[PDB]
Design a binder for this molecule. Sequence first.
Ligand SMILES: NC(=O)c1ccc[n+]([C@@H]2O[C@H](COP(=O)([O-])OP(=O)(O)OC[C@H]3O[C@@H](n4cnc5c(N)ncnc54)[C@H](OP(=O)(O)O)[C@@H]3O)[C@@H](O)[C@H]2O)c1
Ligand SMILES: COc1cccc(NC(=O)c2ccccc2OCc2c(C)noc2C)c1
Length: 314
Amino acid sequence: QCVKLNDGHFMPVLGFGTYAPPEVPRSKALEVTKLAIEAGFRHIDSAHLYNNEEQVGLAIRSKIADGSVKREDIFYTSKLWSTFHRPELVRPALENSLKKAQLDYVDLYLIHSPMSLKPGEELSPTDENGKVIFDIVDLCTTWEAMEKCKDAGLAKSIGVSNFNRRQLEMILNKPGLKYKPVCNQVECHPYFNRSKLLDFCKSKDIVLVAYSALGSQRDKRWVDPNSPVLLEDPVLCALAKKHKRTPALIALRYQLQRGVVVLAKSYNEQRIRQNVQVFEFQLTAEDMKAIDGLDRNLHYFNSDSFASHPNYPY
Ligand SMILES: NC(=O)c1ccc[n+]([C@@H]2O[C@H](COP(=O)([O-])OP(=O)(O)OC[C@H]3O[C@@H](n4cnc5c(N)ncnc54)[C@H](OP(=O)(O)O)[C@@H]3O)[C@@H](O)[C@H]2O)c1
Ligand SMILES: COc1cccc(NC(=O)c2ccccc2OCc2c(C)noc2C)c1
């Protein structure tokens, strides 16, 4: 069950989110990625930021060795972190990711964020006052380096993440653009449904990939605890009983029926296996409008620190 991208490649519409907080041991990412493939996941979403690409790569490698899957069956995504936006840093960053995951190519390589940060191996460079150090980079030059990564065959497709309409247009209107972004991976859920950005992306044949589709991990570092818990929403819960499903399954099915590729993170075997049941049932057009009405313009990631960044997408 895939969507054809604007470069001709195919992307499975349900993806496994691999991020876990640093308090979760790295061995779990290896275990649960195997479980995800066992359950039927084929789209696997990782990033240099996540400090798990070696474990995710080991799991893919293990499921190829036991004959469960072939490399051609797995859609693996990595992401260029914001400290490597400068063009000369892009290809070595991808090559590092490939070496850690022990893969010859990624199916998808993304610009993780438009907010460039100070170049270096430090993921969160902070000044003497503990403030994240920004960098200024022409993201069109970053994209040019991404296009060369596709030409070199190190990435089958290239796309962006956390871009707004204006930043997307910056790429689409770039003189001599060779490859359009195949996708824009953004926070998207019934409380933040991105209908405006989704309509724009559809008009440009760019796939919207939804993260925090299940309402985020509510990490204490970025999520206000008083924010609403998505999966406790009464409309989601009432729809779950109607269909004899779970609120999470409603949230995932919501995205599939509106043309959105949806990610789902779980480090729990039974919830991993439950999430692939999204293909078993179907919401009515009335159910969809009911979920459409839940929009709160609530993004679970906030930071007034990044609000000052020139490229802050919100
Ligand atoms: N490009 C970006 O900037 C960006 C940002 C954030 C995330 N992402 C990616 O998107 C992926 C998912 O987003 P997310 O990290 O915010 O997590 P999420 O998909 O919104 O899931 C949130 C929580 O829901 C739980 N869950 C999973 N299945 C469930 C089910 N059937 N019933 C009840 N609860 C369930 C999970 O807890 P359990 O683990 O206990 O099951 C999970 O922690 C991430 O892993 C990451 O790959 C990308
Ligand atoms: C070095 O640390 C940085 C620097 C910048 C941004 C972040 N972002 C986050 O911590 C984060 C945490 C949880 C969910 C989503 C998150 O960010 C999504 C996002 C948006 C929107 N724009 O860029 C990104 C990335 C972390």
